[PDB]
Design an enzyme around this catalytic site. Sequence first.
Site, PDB file in Angstrom:
ATOM      1  N   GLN A  33     -18.450  10.060   2.365  1.00  0.00           N
ATOM      2  CA  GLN A  33     -19.382   9.604   1.341  1.00  0.00           C
ATOM      3  C   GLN A  33     -18.668   8.774   0.280  1.00  0.00           C
ATOM      4  OE1 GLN A  33     -19.889  10.758  -2.079  1.00  0.00           O
ATOM      5  NE2 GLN A  33     -21.715   9.479  -2.310  1.00  0.00           N
ATOM      6  N   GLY A  39     -15.335  17.458   4.205  1.00  0.00           N
ATOM      7  CA  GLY A  39     -15.329  17.829   5.605  1.00  0.00           C
ATOM      8  C   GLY A  39     -15.398  16.656   6.560  1.00  0.00           C
ATOM      9  N   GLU A  73       4.103  -7.054   5.000  1.00  0.00           N
ATOM     10  CA  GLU A  73       5.204  -6.937   4.044  1.00  0.00           C
ATOM     11  C   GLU A  73       5.026  -5.730   3.133  1.00  0.00           C
ATOM     12  OE1 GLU A  73       7.638  -8.885   4.448  1.00  0.00           O
ATOM     13  OE2 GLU A  73       7.042 -10.950   4.886  1.00  0.00           O
TER      14      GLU A  73
END
EC number: 3.6.5.-
Lengths: 50, 432, 430, 430, 39
Positions: free
Chosen positions: B11, B137, B247
């Site tokens: 989210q 989660g 880089e």
Amino acid sequence: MHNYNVDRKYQYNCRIGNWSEEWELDEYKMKEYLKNKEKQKLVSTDKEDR
Amino acid sequence: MREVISIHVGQGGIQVGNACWELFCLEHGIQPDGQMPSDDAFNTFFSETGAGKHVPRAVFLDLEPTVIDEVRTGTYRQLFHPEQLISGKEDAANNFARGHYTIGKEIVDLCLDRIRKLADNCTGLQGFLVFNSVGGGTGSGLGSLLLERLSVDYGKKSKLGFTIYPSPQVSTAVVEPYNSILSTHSLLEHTDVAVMLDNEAIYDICRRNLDIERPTYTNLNRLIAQVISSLTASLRFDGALNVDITEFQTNLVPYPRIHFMLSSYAPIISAEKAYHEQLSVAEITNSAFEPANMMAKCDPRHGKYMACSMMYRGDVVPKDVNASIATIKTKRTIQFVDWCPTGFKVGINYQPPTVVPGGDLAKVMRAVCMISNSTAIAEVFSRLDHKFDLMYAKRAFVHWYVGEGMEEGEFSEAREDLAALEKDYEEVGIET
Amino acid sequence: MREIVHIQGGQCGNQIGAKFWEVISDEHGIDPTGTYHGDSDLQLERINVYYNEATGGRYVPRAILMDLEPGTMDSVRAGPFGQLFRPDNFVFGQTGAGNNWAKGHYTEGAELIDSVLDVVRKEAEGCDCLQGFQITHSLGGGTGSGMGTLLISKVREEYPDRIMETFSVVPSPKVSDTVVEPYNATLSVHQLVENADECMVIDNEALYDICFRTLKLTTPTYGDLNHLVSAAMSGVTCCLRFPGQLNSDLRKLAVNLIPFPRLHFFMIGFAPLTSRGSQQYRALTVPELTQQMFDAKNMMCAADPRHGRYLTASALFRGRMSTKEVDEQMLNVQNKNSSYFVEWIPNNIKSSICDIPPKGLKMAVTFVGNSTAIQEMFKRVAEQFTAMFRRKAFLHWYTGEGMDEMEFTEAESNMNDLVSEYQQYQDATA
Amino acid sequence: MREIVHIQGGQCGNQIGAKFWEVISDEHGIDPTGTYHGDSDLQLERINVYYNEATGGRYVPRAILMDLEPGTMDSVRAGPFGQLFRPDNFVFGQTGAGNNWAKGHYTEGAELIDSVLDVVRKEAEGCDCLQGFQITHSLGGGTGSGMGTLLISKVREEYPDRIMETFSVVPSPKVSDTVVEPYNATLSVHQLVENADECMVIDNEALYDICFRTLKLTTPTYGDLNHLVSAAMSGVTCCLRFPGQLNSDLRKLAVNLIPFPRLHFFMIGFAPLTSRGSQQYRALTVPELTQQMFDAKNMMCAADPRHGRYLTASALFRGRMSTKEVDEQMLNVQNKNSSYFVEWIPNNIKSSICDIPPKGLKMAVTFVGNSTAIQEMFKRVAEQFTAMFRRKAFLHWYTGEGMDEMEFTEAESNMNDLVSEYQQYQDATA
Amino acid sequence: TTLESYNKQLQKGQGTLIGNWWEERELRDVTGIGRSAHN
Ligand SMILES: Nc1nc2c(ncn2[C@@H]2O[C@H](COP(=O)(O)OP(=O)(O)OP(=O)(O)O)[C@@H](O)[C@H]2O)c(=O)[nH]1
Ligand SMILES: Nc1nc2c(ncn2[C@@H]2O[C@H](COP(=O)(O)OP(=O)(O)O)[C@@H](O)[C@H]2O)c(=O)[nH]1
Ligand SMILES: Nc1nc2c(ncn2[C@@H]2O[C@H](COP(=O)(O)OP(=O)(O)O)[C@@H](O)[C@H]2O)c(=O)[nH]1
Ligand SMILES: [Mg+2]
């Protein structure tokens, strides 16, 4: 020292206890009644209508 | 000809990705409808459809449909490919076990198919950028499993992880430490470079500079979007010292285990105080290395320095850059490790930062974004481990994971691996 | 779309669900004829969570009503918004329970549960991805405390993975109705700790003190108590129904509020609650909300939460607000009351945010908590049970339908058991 | 380039600066928006002395505004030329001192001074060439009289070799606006004598007499008083900011005006001053400019310059004129009034010429005089102070915030010794 | 080195008299853009 729920209770007009709350509650009931009059949703206004 | 692939899982990841794509489409002059008004520096982030509109090289993943469908109803509904906004059916509910062992497989196959098809059209893939919240989660589990799959599918390709860790004292959930250590262990051996993106430091910065007393996630996401844009502007704009995405993996990582990094940005000024300020190169460089300006809640004075990468954009001049860096080296409060005599990579870009209308930041001519690898970062791992084992000592909440199909022993090797990491960090700091 | 279904039994659950469905139709803009006349497009993308769609453009609640007497259903059907429920979801007996657990759980419950099981199975397989179950009932009556727990056991063995919330009206010693309440209370509650994933307790005495102290209403009726229960229960599922920055479902609540499998009893509260007077005289700000929500006398349970320590807590803010202010308020309130929070678990408060305030409000707070002081209620009920069990009063009414003193013995033994392991975490130190 | 940083504290200093900066701005042709619109190239020639340039070419004063109550800057920000001041430099308290010197120098000041010292350090290190400091305040107001002299002490501690200039509004007994002037004034001057490189005293009553008699206007105002002070001050540093026949900077004045390291208190005057009704009859010539300058009543201080003997004098002329006339007029005024100049220091007048006059005037004159006449102000304030201190009235307020009568005794002894050795040289002969 | 600083963009004239003002002056006179044309 003012205490509520004092055994026998009169109407809102007297000042025995908790009068303000009930009076303003009744006032708001009238106010929402005015609002239901303002917006054309009254069950009576339907009843005379039909 | 050179472009990267953007991954937004979780989210928080999707909420920051949507803001950064706002910023990029605004910068390249693309309206939300998806077509340039017309009234090759965009191949990095957009690809032509053949005639007219463009599509970003990004994919969004989330198990619960709320954010995905709300974005589908948003103003960018005509920008994204309708079939790359992948959403699941059931939320992971802050459970790493659900997102890694039970429901992930039903979506990760389609996700990797999408990634393959997106890579097929490209010709100059430079790498992957991934955005997720570790203390969640679905975010942690899906990001971990996708990183594992990509490490074996593509391999040598570079991957940059802008991860949002839980803050030290302020946090929303209680079970965050579990999946925090699990995701950290999973990404340790699969993420080339990780960037700290806590929230308490951002609150402090916005409260002290922008003088905002009621900030929300939008300001934080816009700041992170500005950081990303300043980091990637070199790949698509002309400058005195152009720096490629590759880089970083050659300049900021002394050892394969130590690849966790923390950032800073300057300047951070609103619109009413901008016109009364100097905003010189020396001052903007000095403001970068102060310890309250660090993008993550960690004290840099508690540890040495190993590598610093500073990117400037605007009318920056190497004379002033060298003068400022010489003053910084002369300054005593900042010290580098003995075995790193030179520890700065500087890049220069001629494009001044773009300004979004209605944003808190003002139009500014000179800006610098800094990335730092420091051994003082072991403090956050130590505190997270302590918060872990305090409540792990009596096996709380462990049933929620064991009953989902997860074995009980993984916590042991996760603990051991982070412990080995913290010995590594404390040992590298010793003098030779 | 991760939807849930409603089952209610007994007069108490019937009334609770009756007012809850009115409320949910109210903030979803649904007329008593079941027709949508809302203003937003935001009230239709999640309408499938609670309402199924039928012919004629109307919506129907997915609620099933069960009881042993048709009087309560005849009353609720004649009541307002009674046309929403389908007549097919009414399952009723013709004999009644008589406040006896055995009649409702062994003799008549077994023979009647077949129809309700069939209809709930049908309605469950109808939906796409069922999220869980929620039940509203009282443990002081016969029919509810029997058939509700029997159906809970049945559906739990039928769908082990799904989650189940129950809203339990437990008997309060102060205000009493029947002299046999603790028996069926203990018998029912003995069967919840094995099935219910979440139980949340409510006390009518607690609701009475809330309404008579804070709301200051002269002559409250059951409508007020039912409405408070409906608002508090509705506030839980706002995250799954409306967009927000921090969405949190029933499973997230479970995983973040359950430390151990046998600690699934919760105490809940609602804010802002205020009487008629200062409603426009006082400013609704998150500091005021968080000050009022932790008030001990704001509780909807007779358990007094300042005699113990909090294990975990969670708050579901509604309306637009700033996240930093929420976090700082939570942190400060956790810091000033370290003595009231258990120490071996850090950051034991959950915060969720939703972008839709309720009807007529701009900010609202719903609170759930796991506290060690709830065991006082179980202590009193066990004391009363043992006291009237030692004299074997009125046990013949129970033993006349295949019941024995033995199962009573395991019930009270498990009560004392749960009390022991629920109090021994109170003094636990690392 | 020999630049000076402006720091002002207290209500009086804030009001003085509010028009001093306006005078500087319109003299340099700077609009209230910070955009230069002047006509002469000499206008931008040495704009360095008071301004800084930000991106976009806008100019900002290097003045730091300080006080213990934010109402003053809240008022002056809405005033004209209030947009020039940099918002970050505003430092204000939260409580206020209430004209209590102990409060403003020991309790609130010790805490507040951190931010102002940090910002003044930043300003000092930012400027390439620092010449010195100038401060405006009143010895009768508590917060000013305390925190200003505290800042004096600390700034002088880190910058011992730089020049520092103090603008003290010393109270007169005729127009008394407060009751506790003796205490805080003597406490301020005790510290000020030890650390002030230059201090110039201003009398509001003298300002008012000048405006009533010379300007002959019916209704005087604080605006006109501030305008007079600002014009006098721009006269001091015009020579440092513009070319002339003979430039003489602040250190030049310090060397040429202070004979002994402790006699560093001055009185100032400005010329010409004419009423609106008589301005067309006067002819501006060096002789009449000098005649007005050396007038006893034209001085902005209560001290009678003919009641003592001048230690030294300094006159800065602005505008194009012949220096031979200046020199011969100086010799004439010296030898004609040799009675009022102490004899053992021949040629005790510094004369300086600047080629750029103030806008609207073809010639102008500013005067600074070090004379024995100031002793009576200290004598009279000493009498008021001892009248206060014999009966210990208004003293427990001071001593209840860390103070003791030892500080008052040592301060009064020091100031009495100051007066004695100040009048010592008046009667000294060769 | 604290150049630029208190001398911002200005065309023609004798300048502000701080830093290298003399040296930028003749460059600005002989050719437009006294200092570091904007990119
Ligand atoms: N800075 C910032 N952090 C965010 C934002 N949104 C979520 N987070 C972080 O995400 C953590 C909680 O996880 P969520 O993002 O809400 O949910 P998730 O990552 O999708 O995982 P699930 O809850 O299981 O669905 C919080 O602790 C936040 O730190 C955001 O917009 N900005
Ligand atoms: N809050 C609330 N409580 C109720 C309501 N109806 C009954 N009760 C409570 O439930 C108790 C009686 O439960 P009972 O009806 O015998 O349970 P049942 O036999 O299972 O239906 C009484 O003490 C009441 O306080 C209601 O509509 N609202
Ligand atoms: N020149 C001038 N003097 C003022 C002004 N306002 C007040 N004063 C003088 O300042 C004295 C009081 O100082 P005060 O306001 O108490 O100083 P503060 O405590 O630092 O604010 C009075 O005797 C006034 O004569 C002003 O606007 N201009
Ligand atoms: Mg999520």
